[PDB]
Every structure is written in structure tokens, then in C-alpha cells.
Amino acid sequence: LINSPSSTFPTLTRHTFVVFFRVMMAELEKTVKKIEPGTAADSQQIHEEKLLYWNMAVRDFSILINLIKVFDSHPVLHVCLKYGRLFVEAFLKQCMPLLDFSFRKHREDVLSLLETFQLDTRLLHHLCGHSKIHQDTRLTQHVPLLKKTLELLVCRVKAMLT
């Protein structure tokens, strides 16, 4: 957006970046789905390795969601509400088991993970509101599933804080 209204990396136009952001969030969703929960007696090295994989998955989620607010073509935010919904579903079914397993030792690491996920939680709240005010028939179907899953993940956050 700075050099040409075309980049320092060709094939990068405003019609092709819809594809680029789609496939970027799709590979990101596929990568966050990778990280599996082990056991409580699992080793500290593997724990640190796969929870740091979680950390880079959620920071990539942060930047993938942060580069929506500039861009348009509602197909973009529709594939975001579709793929980020299965992203938070992956986060439900994979992450919080490791949050319970590796908690009493890796306190700073799981706190860094939850504070990294909470900003993209706020951004997904903002994008659900961005879809609600638009009155889009295609976006307003996938919102209430994402709303109740936000209530499920944040109430599981309130559970683990005890």
C-alpha cells in the first residue's frame, strides 16, 4: 500500500492479495491444528517445544487477523469467520488440555500463551461486531457459533485461573 497503489515481492496486487490472505490463514489454521496434547508425565523439553509451537501459531493468528482492518471484499472476512472459527475450535480441542497438563511448572509460558490469545480474541470480537453492523446475510450465519465458542473458551480461561 506504500510503494504502488506491485510490491518488493511481485504477484502482490490488490486482487491477488485476497487469495494470498485466504491461503495464508488456511495454512495457518492447518498449522495450529498440528499441535497435539500429550500427558501430565510428558517431558519438559517436548512440553516447551509444542507450547512454543502454540505460541507462534497464535502470534501468526494475531498478525493474520490484524491485516484484515485495512482490507475489504467481504469474501475476505467471510473466509476469516469460517477458518478462524475452526481455528478457535482447534484451540478448544487441543490447547487447554496442555494448559491443564503443563501448568504448575510452566506458569510464565501458559500466561504468555493466554495473553497472546486474548488480543486475537478481542480482534475476533471486533470482526464479529464488524460483521453484525454490516447486516450481511453471508457473514451473520457464522457469528453466533463463534460467539458461543468465545464464551466457551473465556469461561475455560476463568476455570484455569483458579
List descriptors:
part of a larger assembly; 1 chains; 162 residues; mainly alpha; 70% helix; globular; ligase
Approximately what portion of the residues adopt beta-strand conformation? under 5%
Helical percentage: 55-70%
Q: Could you tell me the number of beta strands?
A: 0
Query: What is the terminal separation in angstroms?
Result: 46 Å
Question: Biggest β-sheet: count, sense, barrel?
Answer: none
Helices, by number, come to 5
Order of helices and strands: HHHHH
Structural class: mainly alpha
Shape: globular
Rg over C-alpha atoms, rounded to the nearest angstrom: 17 Å
PDB class: ligase
Keywords: Complex, ligase
Entry title: Structure of the human Fanconi Anaemia Core-UBE2T-ID complex
Name: Fanconi anemia group D2 protein
Short structural summary:
This protein has 162 residues and is an all-alpha fold. The protein contains five helices and no strands.
